[PDB]
Design a protein around this ligand. Structure first.
Ligand SMILES: [Cl-]
Ligand SMILES: [Cl-]
Ligand SMILES: [Cl-]
Ligand SMILES: [Cl-]
Ligand SMILES: [Cl-]
Ligand SMILES: [Cl-]
Ligand SMILES: [Cl-]
Ligand SMILES: [Cl-]
Lengths: 101, 100, 100, 101, 100, 100, 101, 100, 100, 101, 100, 100
């Protein structure tokens, strides 16, 4: 069975930490990633079963909006990401977080 | 349970004040400083939730009176999930273990 | 003749979708991910020119359908000059060479 | 005895260098730091007795404002900074400037 | 004397097309790629002043066929001072020596 | 007593012209090139105060003639405090010693 | 359940690669590590069930000794390594080899 | 007072055994691993002096029975001077704070 | 099934000759150069088992004729386990893909 | 008054740590440095008044010889080291150890 | 075709003298300096095979006027295989291109 | 004409003495400190050839008088070729340029 990727991007760092906490609390997913691209835009990346990933992104968005100064910019889930993406984009598991799989 | 508190400012002097005020107001440790572009910097403290509540409150109150810059966003997570510390820069460092 | 295709987005989730759509839509290899600041990110693919065309069209389409998605620029070069690969990040990496 | 911290943030590099120059010329403070948070915002940090830091920050803000294209964004002085700050924020002495103490 | 030619774009795909068009139009070597933020990216060529002149003209024209590209500034220096090679990223690299 | 001159531009081609104009206009050494985000880039020269004044004037003049050229700020310090050397990037490098 | 560690140290690189090859061919262990302490001494580290590690270390020492110029210096297996060791010594799984577990 | 204990071996497998045996024999934390050439590696533990005494003793006893290599040198400092930790690699790391 | 061949020498000139002798003698790609101290250096080739056997023989032969040349060890693995790629430096690099 | 440099070189690391502890305990000197040059040769470097440095090197040698497996290779004190040496050789103070001056 | 010439010494001063003597004797470029342990250091020149031959001979002779020097091995490859440039440190660097 | 002088020792305390003696005995600048493994370290000075001679003689003499001192090799090159400074660590650094 495949490993979905879910992503929440926020403007502001405290919002992105709450997004991540809410995601890993709401469903059986692993936080693998935190990406900065400039202009205040930060993305947290989780992996898991497609439906847990759905459950976690919904939770994260709800909670990140209730952060004081919290702004959500974009979200997306990919149920079955192409194998090529792991080797280029920072969406991959690390050994640090492998205990959470 | 070890809480995390965060104050994000516009500008560097405001964030240093946010940090100073946090650690003076309650028994919390300053563990981190994060830059995300657009002049946005966040200072991160850890400690018991009632102490983190007390310090974010003093940090905001003080950082807003800084000549220039602005408090942009703040948040307290009272019982953060294990997983967060292995990805996000909210973890203790050895340099600040002396302050627990 | 290895064509190059690029989709630039404002925002990261949308660039990751563009990448996924591009490699799913045709026989292209995703070789790159480039950040130039200001929320602007570009994913770069390599392959037969007709494949690159199909992939960049699918990628642009899917990326716009992302919640909060913004495509900023896109382009295909059918016959990139050899000098470009030693300066600009459009070259194959060893990690993705299994995907030719 | 307590070593205060003083900070002038400018939009633009030339003005931050002049702020730094005038700070160390105006009083007994060591320039310890130069901090880039991006988006054109640069901060210079001095350390010294609180009364000396106050005088130097005043000179720096005045001279920086007089730079061709000079722009001062924020300033702030902490008289008695908490010890914890130096191990996280770049407000600390470096060995290269210990000489100027 | 080796002239320097520069084209600064907003957006990455536009700078890659500018690069390609420069080296395809004239006997010039693309030596570098500089990011300075605000989405501003410059591609740098070296060669004869007349060849650099033709390459900059092709680059500026070709950049305007890119959807979402914009050329922000350009410049040629016919006889750059030697001091510049050592401070500014306008120098040949070994990776592109084969293109002289 | 070694002066320091700075021209800050918005855009890279224009900073490279400021640098060329400066070193050709008077007896100064270009020591540095500083990037601070938002397209803001500074070229830094060292020399005799009068040489540095001549060169900063020449530099501003020429940068303003770059297509898309923009000068944001300029300054000369005739006699910088020794402390500045060790914190700010205004120092000679070995690669440019050759040019004093 | 406990993941044993197995180590073969050789004098010479080609022999360490063959030790590694034969270890993972002889039993259900993951090669996790390659450690240079200098002076020609290189160690390869496998992880797995203690009975599998024993069989793989035996195969590796035999095949390495049969290398042209092969030289085995030391070997050792720890059945139940203390958890603290992985955070200091390079005996830990990496993400690139998690696949072979 | 926090003691430091050290066992130096010839060879890597012997040192890993030295480390394993130390942490199992008494309440000590493994903080470090040092390589100095000539096949010489040292494992460093911290803890109370009576616990460090107990663990260096078990570490030596076990590491010497390793097939190949040799225990080369050992030492316990019961109350090491502050200064040592800022120069020598005997200090706790954050990765091993969990083991105090 | 891609074999791996290794010649280890004592001395650098001799390892560079082993490498040349190997790539010229048969259809293999030189992928690596490994240093492990005490003057011990290995050159690593990849190819068909029979090509790699031809080339290792050629390499040893030639290295032994270098003035001061010394071959310390050699080995071929016809069908290396996939796990080895990810731990040991026997993998193709992008810079030598050109040569398969 | 000038800052002497004292040095103890040992074969083996536990000996070099004891050398350093004994030096800073015996006299008013600062440990600034630890240098590895290969072949098991490691040097600890202290700074202080010429006579405290003398007192500390004598203490360090005595103690390093009583280390189990302890071997001392070379020592030297320079009362008044040329200013050029700080900028090339690793004998200089660091900010970490400046609290001990 | 660019030949490669190597001289490996024990000791550093002997390798510096070998280097100097090579470039003074013949039309060759010193491109590199390789340390492999055991006090073994190799200096690498490139040029015409006949010029590399003369430089190696001068290097070996001049090395024997150095007190405490010893030449350990030497070798010339007249026509190195292209694959070698990309693995082994025998390639020109930009810093020495001016000496071709 | 900037001569180069080198003293190589087995052991570090002796190399530091050699350096100190060299710069005290004549008008030379200590520019380098080189490690090639195996306990071998070299200090490099630059200056007038007659100065370098005086300094290397004083350095060799003093280094031998160090408790446990061993000089391994020494050499002076009066007129080092220009190519050597871009490859070998014999060049002035900015940090020591105040000592010309
Ligand atoms: Cl913003
Ligand atoms: Cl704002
Ligand atoms: Cl944006
Ligand atoms: Cl701005
Ligand atoms: Cl050996
Ligand atoms: Cl032994
Ligand atoms: Cl030894
Ligand atoms: Cl030795």
């Amino acid at each position: 069975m495949p490993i979905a990727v879910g992503m929440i991007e926020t403007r502001g760092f405290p919002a992105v930490v709450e997004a991540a906490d809410a995601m890993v609390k709401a469903a059986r997913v692993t936080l693998v990633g935190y990406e900065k691209i400039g202009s205040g835009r930060v993305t947290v990346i989780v992996r898991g079963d497609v439906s847990e990933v759905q459950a976690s992104v919904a939770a994260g968005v709800d909670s990140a909006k209730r952060v004081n100064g919290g702004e959500v910019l974009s979200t997306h889930i990919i149920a079955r990401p192409h194998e090529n993406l792991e080797y280029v984009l920072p969406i991959r598991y690390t050994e640090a977080v492998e205990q959470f799989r």
